[PDB]
Ligand binder design. Structure first.
Ligand SMILES: Cc1cn[nH]c1-c1ccncc1
Ligand SMILES: Cc1cn[nH]c1-c1ccncc1
Ligand SMILES: Cc1cn[nH]c1-c1ccncc1
Ligand SMILES: [Cl-]
Ligand SMILES: [Zn+2]
Ligand SMILES: [Zn+2]
Length: 574
């Protein structure tokens, strides 16, 4: 409690001494409350006009148009039983060693951090003293503040590492110290599939289907894809202590700096929350996930890999009960990990809180005691109801997608990502933040269009809309995003060949594709099942009259150099 968090709390009181009070009508039951102080302030989703003018048939589809319009944090998780705590400690110890065999923990640098801010990563900072991250990083006074907190952390204390709720934004300084100590997990790809066997970090949406098809090839039971209800709110203090064991692999300054991030900011937290009754509440708690989103991704992947290996151990009968491991169950658990752990990791695809598991057999479906007792309660099923698995890898949900096997005219086999097309069009019609020029709006539309050409070329409506947007935006204008092989001014046919043929390890024949007409679509009925408007009168008029829509947008942007991409399609090619 207050010996670790007091200084942060003490400091905040004194900046708002004219406003402090122990408000007696505070809604917090599971968060420890400290005080309140006067403030006044809050950005909604804005429509991208370039994408909307080129997707007119979707203007009357509520699932698209509603996407642009518009008491889980205040719960507590019970402490796991002694048997569960032992399983988690043994598995976590083993997993950090496997992940560390071919990697070396190391500090990330001011230089590395500076380069990140200078090409727009979502580091979750705040606006004050400087306007933006770019300005703060370029100012020697910032680094002096960073230095003060840094020496405080080496001394085992904290003053300014406080979360702001809304996503848990910190000041750029606290973000740096997090990245210095734990950035290596992402920067050096600890959760790549090569390094972690279950992980998919850095793999790309064009590989995830092939990875699930490789898991499907293993002998075993159904494929399980159980979602957890509010994963970040079910991270226990036992979880945070197993995660901290990465520091056992560190040395020198780095070990001390990383131990301080875990001890002072993760296992103890201070948060400011807006309450319209508009005060700022200063609350603390020990458990749940509140890191930067990139460290959150890696530690979620780690704890998810651990949880799923334990659920596999439960299905395989490695231990009888979570109440208590006997001396010899401990040796059996250790021995399972050493002899088959790596094989059992290869049976999984894990992206943070999202997993797919192909267990040895279907005993897994009813192996629920460790999973429930670890607090990883499944979403949308009763606590003790057996999991429903998937019999076909092409039906399994993963990372908001499903995956199709698509046969090219020349016999070669693509495995492609897919999701309901209303979700894809709805997302592309939305921009975030203020002060967007027409050029910037056009360049964001072009980013969506090029992603569609690379990932969703097999959807008739998206290949046509992608071609239309690329025809409507000046040819040399560079795709942008405010938070990815489609981010380029290279010819997208050249990029398609590099991604799906040349660099694709599942494609043995490397014969390049000469034109977009060689690149196939889903079956027409499959395209409709996944939300295509092909067959509707609105869609036929849009396709036939597309040059008129392209010319509307070209007239708004003005007299620029444009290319016609529509004749890359059979139906427009004379
Ligand atoms: C330090 C620096 C400067 N220009 N590029 C790098 C760099 C890039 C990628 N990995 C490590 C270093
Ligand atoms: C977490 C997230 C969301 N969209 N994409 C990712 C991602 C990208 C690359 N490697 C791992 C994850
Ligand atoms: C799109 C998404 C969501 N969660 N994770 C991913 C992902 C993972 C790995 N590579 C690319 C993307
Ligand atoms: Cl199925
Ligand atoms: Zn601190
Ligand atoms: Zn589909």
């Amino acid at each position: 409690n207050l010996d670790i968090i007091g200084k942060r709390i003490e400091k905040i009181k004194q900046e708002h001494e004219t406003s402090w009070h122990y408000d007696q009508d505070h809604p917090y039951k599971t968060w420890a409350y400290h005080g309140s102080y006067e403030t006044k302030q809050t950005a909604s989703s804005m429509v991208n006009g370039v994408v909307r003018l080129l997707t007119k048939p979707w203007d009357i589809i509520p699932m698209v148009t509603q996407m642009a319009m518009t008491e889980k944090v205040d719960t507590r998780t019970q402490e796991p039983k002694e048997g569960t705590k032992k399983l988690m400690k043994i598995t976590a110890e083993w997993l950090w060693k496997e992940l560390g065999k071919k990697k070396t923990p190391r500090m990330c640098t001011r230089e590395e951090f500076t380069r990140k801010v200078r090409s727009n990563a979502a580091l979750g900072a705040i606006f004050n003293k400087w306007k933006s991250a770019r300005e703060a990083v370029e100012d020697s006074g910032f680094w002096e503040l960073v230095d003060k907190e840094r020496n405080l952390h080496l001394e085992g204390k904290c003053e300014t590492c406080v979360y702001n709720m809304m996503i848990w934004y910190m000041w750029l300084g606290a973000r740096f110290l997090e990245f210095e100590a734990l950035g290596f997990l992402n920067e050096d790809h600890w959760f790549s599939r090569e390094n972690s066997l279950s992980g998919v970090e850095g793999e790309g949406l064009h590989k995830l289907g092939y990875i699930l098809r490789d898991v499907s090839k293993k002998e075993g039971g159904a494929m399980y894809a159980d979602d957890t209800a509010g994963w970040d709110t079910r991270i226990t203090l036992e979880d945070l202590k197993n995660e901290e064991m990465v520091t056992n692999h560190m040395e020198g300054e780095h070990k001390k700096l990383a131990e301080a991030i875990f001890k002072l900011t993760y296992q103890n937290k201070v948060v400011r929350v807006q309450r319209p009754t508009t005060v700022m509440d200063i609350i603390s708690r020990r458990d749940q996930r509140g890191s930067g989103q990139v460290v959150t991704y890696g530690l979620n992947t780690f704890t998810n890999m651990e949880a799923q290996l334990i659920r596999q151990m439960e299905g395989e009968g490695v231990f009888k009960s979570i109440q208590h491991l006997t001396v010899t169950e401990e040796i059996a658990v250790k021995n399972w990990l050493v002899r088959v752990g790596r094989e059992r990791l290869s049976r999984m695809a894990i992206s943070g809180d999202d997993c797919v598991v192909k267990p040895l057999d279907d005993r897994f479906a009813s192996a629920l005691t460790a999973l429930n007792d670890m607090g990883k309660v499944r979403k949308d099923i009763q606590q003790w109801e057996p999991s429903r698995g998937w019999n076909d890898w092409t039906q399994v949900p993963f990372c908001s997608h499903h995956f199709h096997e698509l046969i090219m005219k020349d016999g070669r086999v693509l495995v492609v990502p897919c999701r309901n097309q209303d979700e894809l069009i709805g997302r592309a019609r939305i921009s975030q933040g203020a002060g967007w020029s027409l050029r910037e709006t056009a360049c964001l539309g072009k980013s969506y269009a090029q992603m569609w050409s690379l990932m969703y070329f097999h959807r008739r409506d998206l290949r046509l809309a992608a071609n239309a947007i690329c025809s409507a935006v000046p040819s040399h204008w560079v795709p942008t995003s405010r938070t990815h092989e489609w981010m380029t001014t290279e010819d997208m046919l050249t990029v398609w060949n590099r991604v799906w043929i040349q660099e694709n390890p599942w494609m043995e024949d490397k014969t390049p594709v000469e034109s977009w007409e060689e690149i196939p679509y889903l079956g027409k009925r499959e395209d409709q099942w996944c939300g295509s408007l092909i067959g509707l009168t609105s869609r036929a008029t849009w396709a036939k009259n597309i040059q008129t829509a392209i010319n509307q947008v070209r007239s708004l942007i003005g007299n620029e150099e444009y290319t016609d991409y529509m004749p890359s399609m059979k139906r427009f090619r004379r």
